[PDB]
Symmetry: C2
Subunit: 137 residues, 2 copies
């Protein structure tokens, strides 16, 4: 279930982080505007750069902490507030997060492994509603 999936992702976090972030950028090419430095590069070109993996790994470490602290796939309000207030997230809206979790669930369903894709879809929806309650437009 959801708790085991956190362990699966953590066990090979740098690899999963890169693959899931590429699935997001490829599904929603207009989202690369938040990431101007990745424009004009294929998947393999992005992965060869240490900065890409370094950054994504740190992102997914925080995502897994939020997921592990959730109750029944409902994140804590205090974790949603951290995500809203981070300077790096200034001017994001909840739709950016909605799209990230649609891509993440699609990746899990195509992987042919035993992810609890329903729990992740629910986590993404509950994270969007928590971000709005914590002040994100």
């Amino acid at each position: 279930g959801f708790k085991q999936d956190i362990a699966t992702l953590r066990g090979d976090l740098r690899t999963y982080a890169q693959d899931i972030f590429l699935a997001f950028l490829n599904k929603y090419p207009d989202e690369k505007r938040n990431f101007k430095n990745y424009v004009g590069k294929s998947d393999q070109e992005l992965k060869s750069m240490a900065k890409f993996g370094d950054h994504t790994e740190k992102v997914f470490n925080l995502m897994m902490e939020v997921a592990d602290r959730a109750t029944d796939c409902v994140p804590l309000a205090s974790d949603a507030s951290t995500l809203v207030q981070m300077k790096q997230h200034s001017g994001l809206t909840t739709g950016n997060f909605e799209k990230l979790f649609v891509a993440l669930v699609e990746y899990m369903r195509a992987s042919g492994q035993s992810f609890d894709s329903q729990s992740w879809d629910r986590f993404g929806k509950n994270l969007v509603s928590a971000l709005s309650s914590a002040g994100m437009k």
Copy 2:
């Protein structure tokens, strides 16, 4: 304390993992008997070898999970059974693990941060005793 230290290490895991594992190999150079490929290499040459980067990341990803599942720095018996039975660990004895943790604790004490070094010393001793009970020589 110990739980916060897991969060500290996870926030810069790649760099902490390679640095601690290098501290282990430089304190105990005979431990290269298990890593014949690492002979004749400086730290900066090891860091640019793909499989050094791979073992080391996966060592620390899993070690952080074992730490997180522990109670008062005592690991789960099931976690010890998994570590003993890994086909990659067939040539190992508990002394290989003891030495890793002696190096890890020395690294934390020298860092000048706020690690709970005493807790990591207990965790390494308790992991060793759990590995023995699970079947490691």
